[PDB]
């Protein structure tokens, strides 16, 4: 029904970007919102659109937002260690690894991610989240964890590639619960909820064959029943559209997906 | 009515991005679609979402789209000069400035822009589009400012990069990408010559300014004076559809003074 939780931005533009002001010759970044307005701790665990790629070493590419410079390349490359104790976005302060010579309002994204440092040589576990600042005391804390429902149902994640090496040499896929277009649509059109879940159909737009049926829970995640030990929904083609079939109860038994 | 024109992508993700195969040790990038698919030259001037930041030098960053690397930093920095005759996206090939060490499928965006080279010191004019190497043309039709003292209204976003005047590097736009995605999703038919949009402050429900949306897909207004216009309007407002209007609908001028 369309209330973003945690640090979900409305649009893709402010999705993984962060903005802040840093003093010259210092590595502390005082976070602000993407539009430049001051960030409030009690609003959210982090400024809207703050990255949540946990268990990895960020590598940012900041730049001065007003673009005062006239000659040189404005891209400044630094790295952030979310496992470090100084990584406290809830307190509107994160410390970069390297000092930045020029002070000013900096805006940047995550360029690539490496396996986390000072963490026993663990792999880039994109399914975990960085330990934000102390949020139990404040009203705004992390969004509740989405546990997988029973009835042999598994949460379906949408995977996109981020640059950066991983210990296994596998593609670096960042999983997400819902596509950002769906989140924007839900935010814009705040339709109410009439059932414990929404029965989505993954249908090929042209051939109109029902590739598989998915349940959309009000918490904002898609679940499915894999057919067997096979990967299940991963075999599905990407040229498909989810169509809302009906409102269903929680105990609805999905037809197994995949072969 | 939700019909994209030119190299317009549906979602923001495929904006200012390009994917292609380049042989090791070379500098020519053979463009493909963003999803690793062959690109049809006849359908579009360029692969979907290919940048149109013309009259400026692109400084791209690239990485292999399957992460086959376990050790080193995957981003490779290169530059593309659109004014060069070798920059021909229509023929699915653009040549980077520097050589690329290892071959493979590289995805990449525009990291920053600099004033165009080989142009007599011209500034980074973002109001022009690259040549695209077209040879009939399937480009999006050029939008002209209508008469009746109407001027097209553009939306500006900052891309990093220097400019000859030290001013913000704001790129113009015709319609926010969320509007484009909504139009594509909701193929609402056009029932009038133009759509009158009210710019309403959500908290106070006050129409700060009124705008005309043309079926071509661009938003126009009427400035109160040469020194004012939509720039004074607060950014927190939301466009609310009001009615279908004829081309001769005379808007109330926006701005002050």
């Amino acid at each position: 029904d369309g209330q973003p939780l945690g640090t979900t931005p409305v649009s893709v533009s402010q999705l993984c970007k962060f903005r802040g002001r840093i003093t010259s010759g210092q590595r502390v970044l005082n976070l602000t919102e993407l539009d430049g307005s001051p960030f409030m701790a009690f609003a959210a665990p982090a400024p809207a659109g703050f990255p949540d790629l946990g268990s990895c070493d960020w590598h940012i590419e900041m730049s001065k937002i007003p673009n005062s410079s006239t000659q040189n390349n404005p891209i400044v490359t630094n790295s952030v260690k979310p496992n470090s104790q100084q990584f406290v976005p809830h307190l509107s302060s994160i410390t970069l690894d390297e000092n930045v010579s020029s002070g000013g309002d900096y805006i940047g994204t995550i360029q690539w991610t490496s396996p986390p440092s000072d963490s026993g040589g663990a792999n880039t576990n994109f399914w975990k989240i960085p330990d934000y600042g102390s949020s139990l005391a404040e009203a705004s804390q992390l969004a509740p964890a989405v546990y997988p429902p029973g009835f042999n149902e598994v949460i379906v994640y949408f995977m996109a590639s981020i640059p950066g090496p991983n210990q296994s040499g596998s593609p670096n896929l960042v999983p997400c619960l819902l596509p950002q277009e769906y989140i924007t649509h839900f935010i814009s059109e705040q339709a109410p909820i009439q059932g414990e879940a929404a029965l989505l159909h993954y249908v090929d737009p042209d051939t109109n064959r029902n590739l598989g049926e998915f349940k959309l829970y009000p918490g904002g995640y898609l679940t499915c029943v894999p057919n067997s030990s096979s990967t299940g929904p991963q075999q599905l083609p990407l040229d498909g559209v989810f169509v809302f079939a009906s409102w269903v109860s929680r105990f609805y038994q999905l037809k197994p997906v995949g072969t | 009515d939700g019909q994209p024109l030119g190299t317009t992508p549906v979602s923001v993700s495929q904006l200012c991005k390009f994917r292609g195969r380049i042989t090791s040790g070379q500098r020519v990038l053979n463009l493909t679609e963003l999803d690793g698919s062959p690109f049809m030259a006849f359908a579009a001037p360029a692969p979907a979402g290919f940048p149109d930041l013309g009259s400026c030098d692109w400084h791209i960053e690239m990485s292999k789209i399957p992460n086959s690397s376990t050790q080193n930093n995957p981003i490779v920095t290169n530059s593309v000069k659109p004014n060069s005759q070798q920059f021909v996206p229509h023929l699915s090939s653009i040549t980077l400035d520097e050589n690329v060490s290892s071959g493979g499928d590289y995805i990449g965006t525009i990291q920053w822009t600099s004033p165009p080279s080989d142009s007599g010191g011209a500034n980074t004019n973002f109001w022009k589009i690259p040549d695209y190497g077209s040879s009939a043309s399937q480009l999006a039709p050029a939008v002209y400012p209508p008469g009746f003292n109407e001027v097209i209204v553009y939306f500006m976003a900052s891309i990093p990069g220097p400019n000859q005047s030290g001013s913000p590097n704001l790129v113009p736009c015709l319609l926010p990408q969320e509007y484009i995605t909504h139009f594509i999703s909701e193929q609402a038919p056009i029932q009038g010559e133009a759509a009158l949009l009210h710019y309403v402050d959500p908290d106070t429900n006050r129409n700060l300014g009124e705008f005309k949306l043309y079926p071509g897909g661009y938003l126009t207004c009427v400035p109160n004076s040469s020194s004012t216009g939509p720039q004074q309007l607060p950014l927190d407002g939301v466009f609310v559809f009001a009615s279908w209007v004829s081309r001769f609908y005379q808007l109330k001028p926006v701005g002050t003074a």
Epitope: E98, S114 | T70, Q71, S102, G104
Partner: antibody
Framework: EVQLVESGAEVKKPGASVKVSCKAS????????MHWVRQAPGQGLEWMGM????????WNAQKFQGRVTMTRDTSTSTVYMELRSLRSDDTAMYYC?????????????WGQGTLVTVCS | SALTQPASVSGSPGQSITISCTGT?????????VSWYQQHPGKAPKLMIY???KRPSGVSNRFSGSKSGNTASLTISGLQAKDEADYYC??????????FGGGTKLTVLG
């Protein structure tokens, strides 16, 4: 042209800690990972770990786990190797080597080598 | 651990020689990145073969490495004296570490 040079040959009393540097120039420091390779006289090459020039990121072999401590300096574009409790077998030809290419993933560009010596 | 390698293999000039590097599945078989090396006794080692069969610029086309199951092999054709050096194989282990081979010896008896 890109080359790696290091501190030089050192002589150390076993039980202390040795400090080895590796000057890097002619390329973007943070772009390429730096590895450390040792070769004992008459023995094969050994790999004592890797250092990410971009913000720490140390991964070292289990047989040398807890023994080596590697850090980098972004200002001087120099990577530091620190090994404590040197033993009789620890004397070796200490090489710092970056990869030939970002996507090559093979040590192609090696240093001149440093000779830490142990007698005991 | 360390890749098991032959202690020394020799061949006369003219007849191509093949040196094989052996390891477990986690070392060589699991991952496609194996690097083949060669070290002049006084000079620093450089790169012959990387990514199983890909060759960096600056080394002659005669060198060619391959991976066969759990065993990786390097082929040298038409040997001369300048190839007399120890060859080292290295593979990316499953422990997120690079592990070097034992170190083989080749001497041209001509």
């Amino acid at each position: 042209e890109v080359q790696l040079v290091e501190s030089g040959a050192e002589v150390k009393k076993p039980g202390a800690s040795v400090k080895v540097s590796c000057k890097a120039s002619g390329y973007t420091f943070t772009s390429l990972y730096m590895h450390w390779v040792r070769q004992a006289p008459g023995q094969g090459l050994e790999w004592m770990g890797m250092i990410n020039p971009s913000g720490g990121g140390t991964w070292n072999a289990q047989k040398f786990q807890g023994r080596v401590t590697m850090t980098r300096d972004t200002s001087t574009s120099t990577v530091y190797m620190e090994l404590r409790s040197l033993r009789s077998d620890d004397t070796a030809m200490y090489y710092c080597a970056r990869d030939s290419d970002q996507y090559s993933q093979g040590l192609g560009y090696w240093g001149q080598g440093t000779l830490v010596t142990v007698c005991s | 651990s360390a890749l098991t390698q032959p202690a020394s293999v020799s061949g006369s000039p003219g007849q191509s020689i093949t040196i094989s590097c052996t390891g477990t599945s986690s070392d060589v078989g699991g991952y496609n990145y194996v690097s083949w090396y060669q070290q002049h006794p006084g000079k620093a080692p450089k790169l012959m073969i990387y990514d199983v069969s890909k060759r960096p610029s600056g080394v002659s086309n005669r060198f060619s490495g391959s991976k066969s199951g759990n065993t990786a092999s390097l082929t040298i054709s038409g040997l001369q004296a300048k190839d007399e050096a120890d060859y080292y194989c290295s593979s990316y282990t499953s422990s997120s570490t690079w592990v070097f081979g034992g170190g083989t010896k080749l001497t041209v008896l001509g």
